[PDB]
Automatic annotation (TrEMBL), chain A:
PANTHER family in UniProt: 40S RIBOSOMAL PROTEIN S11 FAMILY MEMBER, 40S RIBOSOMAL PROTEIN S11-RELATED
InterPro entries referenced in this protein's UniProt entry, alphabetically: NA-bd_OB-fold, Ribosomal_uS17, Ribosomal_uS17_arc/euk, Ribosomal_uS17_CS, Ribosomal_uS17_N
rRNA-binding among keywords: yes
Domain named Small ribosomal subunit protein uS17 N-terminal: residues: 7-70
Native source species: Kluyveromyces lactis (strain ATCC 8585 / CBS 2359 / DSM 70799 / NBRC 1267 / NRRL Y-1140 / WM37)
Full protein name: RP41
Keyword line: Ribonucleoprotein, Ribosomal protein, RNA-binding, rRNA-binding
From TrEMBL, chain B:
InterPro entries per the UniProt record, alphabetical: Ribosomal_eS8, Ribosomal_eS8_CS, Ribosomal_protein_eS8_euk, Ribosomal_Se8/biogenesis_NSA2
Lineage: Eukaryota, Fungi, Dikarya, Ascomycota, Saccharomycotina
CDD domains: Ribosomal_S8e_like
Any one of the GO CC terms: ribosome
Pfam family, one: Ribosomal_S8e
Keywords: Ribonucleoprotein, Ribosomal protein
Highest taxon listed in the record's lineage: Eukaryota
GO biological process, one term: translation
Gene Ontology MF: a single term: structural constituent of ribosome
Protein name in the entry: 40S ribosomal protein S8
Similarity section: Belongs to the eukaryotic ribosomal protein eS8 family.
Automatic annotation (TrEMBL), chain C:
UniProt keywords, alphabetically: Ribonucleoprotein, Ribosomal protein, RNA-binding, rRNA-binding
Span of domain RNA-binding S4: 41-105
Annotated GO CC locations: cytosolic small ribosomal subunit
Keyword RNA-binding: yes
Pfam families, per database record: 40S_S4_C, KOW, Ribosomal_S4e, RS4NT, S4
Coiled coil (residue ranges): none
Organism: Kluyveromyces lactis (strain ATCC 8585 / CBS 2359 / DSM 70799 / NBRC 1267 / NRRL Y-1140 / WM37)
Record has Ribonucleoprotein as a keyword: yes
Name of the protein: 40S ribosomal protein S4
Matching SUPFAM superfamilies: Alpha-L RNA-binding motif
Similarity section: Belongs to the eukaryotic ribosomal protein eS4 family.
Assembly and oligomerization: Component of the small ribosomal subunit (SSU). Mature yeast ribosomes consist of a small (40S) and a large (60S) subunit. The 40S small subunit contains 1 molecule of ribosomal RNA (18S rRNA) and 33 different proteins (encoded by 57 genes). The large 60S subunit contains 3 rRNA molecules (25S, 5.8S and 5S rRNA) and 46 different proteins (encoded by 81 genes).
TrEMBL record, chain D:
Subunit field text: Component of the small ribosomal subunit (SSU). Mature yeast ribosomes consist of a small (40S) and a large (60S) subunit. The 40S small subunit contains 1 molecule of ribosomal RNA (18S rRNA) and 33 different proteins (encoded by 57 genes). The large 60S subunit contains 3 rRNA molecules (25S, 5.8S and 5S rRNA) and 46 different proteins (encoded by 81 genes). Interacts with snoRNA U3. uS11 interacts with MPP10. Component of the ribosomal small subunit (SSU) processome composed of at least 40 protein subunits and snoRNA U3.
Protein name (record): RP21
Domain Small ribosomal subunit protein uS4 N-terminal: 5-105
Residues of the full protein shown: 2 to 126 of 188
Keywords: Ribonucleoprotein, Ribosomal protein, RNA-binding, rRNA-binding
Function: Component of the ribosome, a large ribonucleoprotein complex responsible for the synthesis of proteins in the cell. The small ribosomal subunit (SSU) binds messenger RNAs (mRNAs) and translates the encoded message by selecting cognate aminoacyl-transfer RNA (tRNA) molecules. The large subunit (LSU) contains the ribosomal catalytic site termed the peptidyl transferase center (PTC), which catalyzes the formation of peptide bonds, thereby polymerizing the amino acids delivered by tRNAs into a polypeptide chain.
Family from the record: Belongs to the universal ribosomal protein uS4 family.
Any GO MF annotation of the entry: structural constituent of ribosome
GO biological process, one term: translation
Keyword RNA-binding: yes
Length: 155, 188, 260, 125
RNA sequence: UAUCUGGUUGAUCCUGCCAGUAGUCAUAUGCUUGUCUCAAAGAUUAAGCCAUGCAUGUCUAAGUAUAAGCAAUUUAUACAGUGAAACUGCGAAUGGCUCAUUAAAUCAGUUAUCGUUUAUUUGAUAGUUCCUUUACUACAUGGAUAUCUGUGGUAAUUCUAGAGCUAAUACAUGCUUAAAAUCUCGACCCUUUGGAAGAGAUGUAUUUAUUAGAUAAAAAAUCAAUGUCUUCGGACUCCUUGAUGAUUCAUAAUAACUUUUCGAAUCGCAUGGCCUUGUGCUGGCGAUGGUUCAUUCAAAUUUCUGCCCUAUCAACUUUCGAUGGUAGGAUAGUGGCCUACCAUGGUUUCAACGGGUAACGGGGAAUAAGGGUUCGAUUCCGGAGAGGGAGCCUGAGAAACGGCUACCA
RNA sequence: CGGUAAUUCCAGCUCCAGUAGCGUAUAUUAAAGUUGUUGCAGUUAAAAAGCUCGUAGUUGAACUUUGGGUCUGGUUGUCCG
RNA sequence: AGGACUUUUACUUUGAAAAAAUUAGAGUGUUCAAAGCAGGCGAAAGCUCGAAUAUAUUAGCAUGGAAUAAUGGAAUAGGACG
RNA sequence: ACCCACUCGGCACCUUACGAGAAAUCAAAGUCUUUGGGUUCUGGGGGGAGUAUGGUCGCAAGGCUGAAACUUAAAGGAAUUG
RNA sequence: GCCCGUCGCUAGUACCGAUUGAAUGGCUUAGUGAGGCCUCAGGAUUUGCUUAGAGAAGGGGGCAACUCCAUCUCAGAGCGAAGAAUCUGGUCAAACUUGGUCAUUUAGAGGAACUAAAAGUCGUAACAAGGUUUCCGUAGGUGAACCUGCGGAAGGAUCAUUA
């Protein structure tokens, strides 16, 4: 779901105010800026050496992670550059002393540095309002597959 | 009267929210500046908490910066050639942020001449020794020399004339220019 | 409400001003000043109620106007000045000096304190920043902006303002095993020693405090104010030294110390 | 708008309003101590019930529990200060055994009658 | 504050409801009514309509005094006293009332603003306004303007047109004023290690580019570039760096930019010291201002969870923004908040969407073995509203209504 | 209850209950184990879909270190100082 | 106090929090009480103790525990260590 | 193919209360005030009424879903004596 | 003994209902759209710089470039600066007209009912073997309860034929 071209749209895609000097003869790939979101969260090497842009990247973009940290399960990875996470919980009805299974759908913005798919449990972090509904940035794909790490059977 | 609150929008689910708390003053939105070229005419607007804002409609000259050697000069904007949002602004010569314009480019030219003196487009001993110590490091790339011979520089504006009132930006240079000229050749 | 609010109804006043719920519809709203109004103490409350030197509003106004009150070496002629925690109130008449420290019930108790030490004040460091032209500065809890501080003074620290020049006299570094005061919540007025300060990556530092009676509790770091070294407080602690005797122990104190 | 001060009821009429034995007992207590109405017995029964709810709640709590100690001995000292509970039975288990007649006995009416300066209960009233 | 009783039958045991019983900061009403304390009170229907009268104006020794107002006496040649009026400044956005709209809406608990504005209060905060400085008001720059004096108009309204003076912390301008260091440009020489007479700019504010804003730990060779000292082997040994969990943060630096913001032409009291003994030089305590950064009162948004009945409401939303992407505009600021072009998405049997609420949410009230049921218009906290709707000036703060504009009634 | 002896209607006498309060109306709570999670019933009193499959929901067999010995700290009831 | 890996929960103990008023409840002769946060004691010559506590059963934060209930490891070894 | 003994599963049956019910009776209608193995559907006095309306299925017949206004002190279950 | 239905009378409740009704409110197609705000213009008037030539009479403090002067004063003309009415395009959009739609009230000829009142009428279905056992589903019929046909069920009037 990611275009091969590093910039695909009409506007140019650059990290604002990080400049690579063309007159210089170092001729490294580019000058890519990055940061660590803290909380003992490892920045992915796919973001470290990657070539995407993703204005709203917790690791490379301007957005900062602060506030709530929510763990959930991916219910929809199939809309562009964003994720829909199913968070399940038990509401405690006290008149019966009984619990009640309930679910909420939290939109978030997964960076291209992560490879997500339906069913992955994801640790996500609070940030600024990114869109009308997304307020969280995907920070870790804990379960990449879960039960699909081993697929084939060849003794 | 143009509100920017979220109440008039439908909910994430899609329900039509009922009207509530008729829109306030801390939620207002003002008219677009849709600036033009020529006969500088900046109108002050008194916004929230004082803080004079400046609408910069009809702006002709502004500061522009060169990143390679890092030098800024006041120069004239001469039309807009590309806009990443809407080509309608390009046809109407509406100047907003991130628009791509042409530059008279003379001030950069004789700054280069008094700085390196390579005679693009085709003394005291102190200046001669400065140039000798420079030792022709001014190996600036070929396309900028091409439009120097043409005489009009390709620049991308970076200031917001709608808010700041200025007309500041930077010249396209390096792969930047590359990208956009492809787009321009798409237009051509 | 469209704009700021300038009225404080009597029931909405903090229960540490602890006024009478009758005999008045409103309560003195503290004007803007060095302290949060929820945490501060208006001068009218301190004089009319705590000291009873006055009788009502007009008397407090007359007292403040003729420049007998001196808050931290300054006159402060406004009725609802937020004289907050650790401020010094000087009355040249009766030559008396007070320092506002919470009694362990958690209230701004009347603390008559000597003239010699009244020259200075203590303060908690809430920020250490670099202002324009590269000048370091420190913001205390009073909002005092002290310029050119000691280079190794950090946040959450404590410092000793001379209160005359308003500069840096001495400071105490926040770390384990240090005498400390509590300035909010259930542990108001409590004084102890820092046993441990659990970091809690991501926010809301907590510190464990053990007092002289060997009781232990835990409090937020925003809520904490280092006051000196164990056995050597840098100020004169109020009567009781904030041990928080149990209600049964308080009853035993009432029974034992009793003469009529 | 000024902060209200809380008025509160001090009696509770019984559920069965026409119990013959209860009515006769109430009249006996009214005539013994010269009570003007039968609301007086309701008030004393309500006071006894409040004291008793507190006593049973404290009893439910575990022995040697700070709440039990503090509030229990507070209630006992208050009742022995009133005089209804004799010093012999300061135990918080005899406090449940108090009867309405005990609080009736400590009224200034009956005390003036006991001292003898009033030779009749209605004379005391 | 764990209780039952009368009624189906000729009679019985049940299921069952009706009725009885006790409440009710739940009202209404009937009949009575002596005292002290205390107190709700046009919420229910009509957020229906309003005569009339009040409900916000404000002056200190310290902004402006020529009222032809008062005091004219012990303080009075500009002025001092008191003081109408008016200009100026500030509040009028607080308070008070009502619950009409509103069902993830408000609100409650709990977070966030490294996503923003903030009069005031409190603490700090600036030499450069000179621009070629060998000719300027800085011992003080200009013009209006209310109040007032007089002429009116209208039937009337806090309706004001014309004329004549007049002021400011009102409106406009504008001066000093150091040194230092850093950048840039050179009248020359003397053969390199090239190194130097000298000239202009640099406060802050705004805008844009770029740089620094470091940091896990011992040694090398080499090549180039070429810097100091050389006791001419070569050594380079010394490099300064704050905060958070994180940043493009704080801050600093370079280049520039601006229809060029601020950097005291303001008041009161006391009027001391130096003698350069003159109105000379300096000089205290305050009051107002004033840029920026904090702090406080806050304001806006904002994370998780929590709402009454209903399926005789099962699919809802998107051409007109519905979900997301990017760029721009607007915003104080994030944000489909709006626009342009793309993607076709988002919610839902864990009840979405729709409908109803004689629903404002909550702290709480009644009731009480325990579990609960009902109520919460109203003394506190929030929200909303001023007949219904929209629109806006002033300010720090209003979509204000005891502020205006228009439509509807 | 009232159909010529009305303990029930209208009155007089006596008495009863609350008492400066009492009576009515609606609403509501306990009574209501007549909303039942604690805690209701379904053979005939009202009430087991005609039967079976079946998504969601609810629920779901057993099993993965149990023992011991010592030292030692508080708290008790110990016997008494 | 730093790199390093962290199976994840549900559950439960403790604490910080859940504004005051209200409920509970301590002290206190408003003449008693509803109440109120007062008051008390000197020799009468200024000296004083107060304005206690608990609960809120949900959501969030920290913390100790590991029975009960659920998920995950190593089966193609692409497993664990040196 | 019978006979004897045992066992699993099924339609059933006799006796009994030591258990349950208002009883008739039930070996489940027991293990229920000493109240909790999992789970689905249904009922809240009688009548109006399984009526009207609104859906939905059906060619039609009709099926599924399905009240209220109002009225009523009973309707009803089992058993006992006539 | 008890009771069932049709028809007959009275009061109430509710429904359907042609009238292609009526009102209110909600949205809404289409067409108008006040007023504010922004913008394009516009330019009454107020002004400042200028030498733009006069009378002013030392209209400088020396008959004269006054040894001109913040000089009397308009034709100047330019250059500004502020700037009202008016006005171009939007923008927020109230509201109007026109139909459409839905929701609630709202009448309404007439029709089909259901209750309560029990001393009307015609029968006597059910409760006993109710004198044809009863009841259920379905279909037909008929003054009326009801009858009949086909399958059931005992809540039957049999728990029973190894006679
Ligand atoms: Mg208000
Ligand atoms: Mg009960
Ligand atoms: Mg019967
Ligand atoms: Mg009978
Ligand atoms: Mg009843
Ligand atoms: Mg009297
Ligand atoms: Mg009303
Ligand atoms: Mg004024
Ligand atoms: Mg005066
Ligand atoms: Mg709704
Ligand atoms: Mg950088
Ligand atoms: Mg910065
Ligand atoms: Mg954007
Ligand atoms: Mg309402
Ligand atoms: Mg309310
Ligand atoms: Mg409510
Ligand atoms: Mg209402
Ligand atoms: Mg309110
Ligand atoms: Mg309003
Ligand atoms: Mg009205
Ligand atoms: Mg203001
Ligand atoms: Mg309004
Ligand atoms: Mg009004
Ligand atoms: Mg108002
Ligand atoms: Mg007005
Ligand atoms: Mg008689
Ligand atoms: Mg039942
Ligand atoms: Mg039957
Ligand atoms: Mg039945
Ligand atoms: Mg069945
Ligand atoms: Mg299933
Ligand atoms: Mg198991
Ligand atoms: Mg509270
Ligand atoms: Mg009480
Ligand atoms: Mg029924
Ligand atoms: Mg039926
Ligand atoms: Mg139908
Ligand atoms: Mg029977
Ligand atoms: Mg009728
Ligand atoms: Mg127009
Ligand atoms: Mg016949
Ligand atoms: Mg028959
Ligand atoms: Mg026959
Ligand atoms: Mg026959
Ligand atoms: Mg028959």
């Amino acid at each position: 779901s990611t275009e091969l071209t590093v910039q695909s749209e009409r506007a140019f895609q650059k990290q604002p105010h990080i400049f690579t000097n063309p007159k210089a003869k170092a001729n490294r790939k580019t000058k890519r800026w990055y940061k660590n979101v803290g909380l003992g969260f490892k920045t992915p090497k796919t973001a470290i050496e990657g070539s995407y842009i993703d204005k709203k990247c917790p690791f490379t973009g301007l957005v900062s992670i602060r506030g709530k940290i929510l763990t959930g399960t991916v219910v929809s990875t199939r809309m562009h550059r964003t994720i829909v996470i199913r968070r399940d919980y038990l509401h405690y009805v006290p008149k019966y002393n009984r619990y009640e299974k309930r679910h909420k759908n939290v939109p978030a913005h997964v960076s291209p540095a992560f490879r997500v798919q339906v069913g992955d449990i994801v640790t996500v972090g609070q940030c600024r309002p990114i869109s009308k509904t997304v307020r969280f940035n995907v920070l870790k794909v804990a379960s990449a597959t879960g039960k699909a790490n081993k697929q084939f059977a060849k003794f | 009267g143009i509100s920017r609150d979220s109440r008039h929008k439908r909910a994430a689910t899609g329900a039509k929210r009922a009207q509530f708390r008729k829109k306030r003053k801390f939620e207002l939105g003002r008219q677009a500046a849709n600036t033009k070229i020529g006969t500088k005419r900046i109108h002050p607007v008194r916004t929230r908490g004082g803080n004079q804002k400046f609408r910069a409609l009809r702006i002709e000259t502004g500061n522009f910066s060169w990143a390679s050697e890092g030098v800024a000069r006041k120069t004239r904007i001469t039309g807009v050639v590309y806009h990443p949002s809407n080509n309608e602004l390009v046809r109407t010569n509406t100047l907003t942020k991130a628009a791509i314009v042409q530059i008279d480019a003379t001030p950069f030219r004789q700054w280069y001449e008094s700085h390196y003196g390579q005679s693009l487009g085709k003394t005291s001993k102190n200046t001669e020794r400065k140039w000798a110590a420079r030792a022709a490091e001014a190996k600036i790339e070929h396309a900028v020399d091409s439009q120097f011979g043409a005489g009009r520089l390709y620049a991308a504006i970076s200031s917001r004339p709608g808010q700041s009132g200025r007309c500041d930006g930077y010249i396209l240079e390096g792969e930047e220019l590359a990208f956009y000229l492809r787009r321009l050749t798409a237009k051509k | 409400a469209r704009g700021p609010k300038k009225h404080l109804k009597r029931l909405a006043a903090p229960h540490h001003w602890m006024l009478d719920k009758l005999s008045g519809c409103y309560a003195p709203r503290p004007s803007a000043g060095p302290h949060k109004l929820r945490e501060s103490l208006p001068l009218i409350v301190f004089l009319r109620n705590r000291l009873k030197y006055a009788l009502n509003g007009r008397e407090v106004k007359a007292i403040l106007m003729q420049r007998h009150v001196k808050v931290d070496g300054k006159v402060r002629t406004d009725t609802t000045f937020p004289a907050g925690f650790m401020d010094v109130i000087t009355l040249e008449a009766t030559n008396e000096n007070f320092r506002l420290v919470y009694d362990v019930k958690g209230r701004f108790a009347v603390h008559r304190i000597t003239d010699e030490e009244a020259s200075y004040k203590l303060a908690k460091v809430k920020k250490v920043q670099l202002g324009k032209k590269g000048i370091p500065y420190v913001v205390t809890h009073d909002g005092r902006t002290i310029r050119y501080p000691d280079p190794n003074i950090k946040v959450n620290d404590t410092v000793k303002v001379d209160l005359a020049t308003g500069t840096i006299t001495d400071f105490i570094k926040f770390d384990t095993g240090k005498l400390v005061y509590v300035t909010g919540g259930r542990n108001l007025g409590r004084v102890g020693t820092i046993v441990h300060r659990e970091r809690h990556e991501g926010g809301f530092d907590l510190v464990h405090i053990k007092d002289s009676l060997e009781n232990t509790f835990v409090t937020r770091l925003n809520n904490v104010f280092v006051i000196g070294e164990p056995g050597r407080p840098w100020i004169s602690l109020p009567k009781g030294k904030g041990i928080k005797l149990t209600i049964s122990e308080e009853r035993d104190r009432r029974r034992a110390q009793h003469g009529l | 708008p000024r902060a209200p001060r809380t008025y509160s009821k001090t009696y509770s009429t019984p559920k069965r309003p026409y119990e013959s034995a209860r009515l006769d007992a109430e009249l006996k207590l009214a005539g013994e101590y010269g009570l003007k109405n039968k609301r007086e017995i309701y008030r004393i029964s309500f006071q006894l019930s409040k004291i008793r709810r507190a006593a049973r709640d404290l009893l439910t709590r575990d022995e040697k529990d700070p709440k039990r100690l503090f509030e229990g001995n507070a209630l006992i000292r208050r009742l022995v200060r009133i005089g209804v509970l004799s010093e012999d039975k300061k135990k918080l288990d005899y406090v449940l055994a108090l009867k309405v007649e005990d609080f009736l006995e400590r009224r200034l009416q009956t005390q003036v009658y006991k001292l003898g300066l009033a030779k009749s209960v209605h004379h005391a009233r």
